[PDB]
């Protein structure tokens, strides 16, 4: 019923260099629909069910920043994305505002740019849960977590 976030994280990690490069050169989440390697990656995670499609597009597009940009770290809730971006000490607060205010597709593009810069260490299944809904509530909590960390 729910996407196995760690399984997908592992699948992306041990992906062959070819399939990985084909996914990484995508410039926005919807372009993943043109990549055969993308479909094979997310098929065992419920892609053919339309319920999961928008979530899987966000998850994989965030991962597509690189195999080594998002480092999963186990809980001791676990490190949220907002706290993780602040933990890097590289991201200006203004860029977080611009992220949480952005509309569709543009938000994912800006997020991935932030992930590239920040190289966050976080709780990946927790971030995936956030990417699944990605409502106005999740976006405000992102900004507030970032601010509460700094």
């Amino acid at each position: 019923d729910e996407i196995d976030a760690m399984a997908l994280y592992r699948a992306w990690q041990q992906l062959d260099n070819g399939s990985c490069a084909q996914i990484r050169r995508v410039s926005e989440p919807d372009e993943l629909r043109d990549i055969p390697a993308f479909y094979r990656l997310v098929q065992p995670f419920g892609w053919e069910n339309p319920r999961h499609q928008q979530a899987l597009l966000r998850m994989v597009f965030c991962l597509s920043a690189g195999k080594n940009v998002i480092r999963h770290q186990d809980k001791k809730t676990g490190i949220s994305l907002g706290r993780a971006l602040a933990n890097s000490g590289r991201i200006n607060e203004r860029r977080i505002f611009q992220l949480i205010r952005a509309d569709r597709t543009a938000d994912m593009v800006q997020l991935r740019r932030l992930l590239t810069h920040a190289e966050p260490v976080l709780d990946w299944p927790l971030m995936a849960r956030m990417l699944t809904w990605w409502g106005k509530r999740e976006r405000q909590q992102l900004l507030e977590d970032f601010v509460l960390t700094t």
Binding site: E93, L143, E144, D145, V147, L148
Partner: protein
């Protein structure tokens, strides 16, 4: 005369038609009465009058006698004996000492009776929202009750007019009985405690007048002078003939239609130990300070169980119970205790809100305890926001969002109460209380967001907002068992 003639508006405990009895009929029969007026605040004012009367005419010599008179009405001979030395001070129309009045008031105009009707007038919106002519003709009972209410619970008429000894708009808290007779007796301090309560000028303000611009040490006021204190110079006009009272709707031979008043000021230094109100204990420097409780920025209330809400706030939040309540606890520590209570929220002369519980269990306590917890969680979160808002040099209503949201809390949660109370029983109690928590949790989030919504897109306030919401969820998590 309040001690002789009929003026007490009652109807049988579970009966029907209103009848006007006298103090003797109340004190000397096993008849079950309950006060009956169109207004709860006036029913409380009446009871306060009755209690203050019974406090001077018949304090029990000990707890043993205290318990006796409650179960056994006095005989008419005993009553006449006790009221005999007091008849002189309870005349409405009188030559030199009218009840709670002042002969020789210098006033150019005659003040309408509505000014004693606490809330019917007082604000610029009153003439638009209220029914006219509620004070065109007041019976004898309502007039005395209204006078007593103005001196105790209501704020002053305006500039140059002073408020009661407990201050403006105090909360009055009485021990509740099975009927009117028991309730009155239940709130009369026995002679020993009476002496311990008041360790003076023991004559009324309408017999021994207050001197203009004089400073009065609180310790220099007798208990009858204080209980029947009149801070204002008021003089009734000559009443009129038989007809309906515009306040209670009953027929009356004498009906007052106006009164005279004049500016009159003084100063009571210190705090008079009034036995009818709970207080707040604060320690500033090395001294102990007391402040009588009042509905300040909110008036905590729920339908059906407001007395329980107020009771728990006193019991839990430096609050201390009223002296009459402290007595009852000592006399019957194991006996269950419910309140008869009331007060006003005011903006100076304007009455903004009325909350009164006048009627004559552990689950309910648990429900109230749970309710207050979420209330407190919300307050701490929004006070955190309001302080941060202030420290950030922002101006506007952002510094008091915790006040509005608290008022909205009670009003929004009141809608949940009828269904909660209807489904409470032995086996369902834990389930309906759990459901209440989820409801109140959701409500707190809604009210937080609502209070904070006008300050979206204020980037300089994001750390204040974030801290405030984090505070809210921290306290919300502590509330789930």
């Amino acid at each position: 005369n309040l001690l002789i003639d009929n003026w007490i508006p009652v109807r049988p405990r579970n009966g029907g038609k209103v009848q006007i009895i006298n103090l003797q009929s109340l004190y000397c029969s096993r008849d079950q009465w309950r006060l009956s007026l169109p207004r709860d605040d006036m029913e409380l004012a009446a009871l306060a009058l009755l209690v203050c009367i019974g406090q001077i005419i018949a304090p029990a010599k000990d707890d043993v006698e205290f318990r006796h008179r409650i179960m056994n009405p006095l005989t008419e001979d005993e009553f006449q004996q006790l009221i005999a030395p007091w008849i002189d001070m309870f005349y409405l129309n009188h030559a030199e000492h009218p009840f709670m009045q002042t002969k020789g008031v210098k006033a150019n105009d005659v003040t309408p009776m509505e000014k004693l009707l606490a809330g019917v007038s007082g604000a610029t919106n009153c003439a638009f929202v209220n029914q006219p002519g509620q004070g065109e003709a007041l019976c004898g009972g309502c007039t005395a009750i209204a006078l007593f209410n103005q001196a105790n619970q209501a704020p002053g008429f305006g500039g140059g007019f002073k408020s009661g000894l407990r201050g403006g708009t105090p909360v009055t808290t009485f021990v509740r009985g099975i009927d009117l007779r028991s309730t009155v007796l239940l709130n009369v301090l026995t002679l020993p405690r009476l002496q311990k309560q008041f360790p003076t000028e023991n004559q009324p303000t309408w017999i021994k007048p207050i001197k203009s611009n004089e400073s009065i040490p609180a310790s220099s006021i007798g208990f009858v002078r204080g209980l029947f204190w009149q801070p204002a110079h008021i003089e009734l006009c000559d009443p009129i003939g038989i007809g309906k009272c515009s306040c209670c709707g009953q027929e009356s031979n004498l009906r007052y239609t106006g009164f005279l008043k004049e500016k009159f000021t003084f100063t009571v230094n210190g705090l008079w130990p009034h036995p009818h109100s709970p207080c707040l204990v604060t320690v500033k420097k090395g001294e102990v300070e007391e402040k009588f409780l009042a509905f300040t920025t909110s008036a905590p209330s729920w339908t059906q169980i407001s007395r329980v809400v107020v009771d728990k706030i006193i019991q839990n939040e430096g609050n201390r119970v009223a002296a009459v309540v402290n007595q009852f606890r000592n006399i019957a520590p194991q006996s269950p205790l419910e309140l008869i209570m009331g007060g006003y929220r005011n903006n100076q002369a304007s009455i903004l809100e009325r909350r009164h519980d006048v009627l004559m269990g552990n689950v309910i306590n648990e429900i109230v305890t749970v309710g207050l917890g979420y209330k407190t969680a919300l307050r701490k979160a929004l006070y955190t926001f309001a302080e941060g808002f202030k420290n950030k040099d922002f101006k506007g209503a952002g510094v008091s969002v915790h006040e509005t949201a608290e008022r909205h809390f009670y009003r929004q949660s009141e809608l949940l109460i009828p269904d909660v109370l209807a489904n409470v029983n032995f086996s369902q109690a834990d389930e309906v209380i759990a459901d209440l928590r989820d409801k109140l949790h959701q409500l707190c989030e809604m009210l937080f967001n609502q209070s904070v919504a006008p300050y979206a897109h204020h980037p300089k306030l994001i750390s204040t907002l974030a801290l405030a919401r984090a505070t809210l969820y921290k306290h919300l998590r502590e509330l789930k068992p």
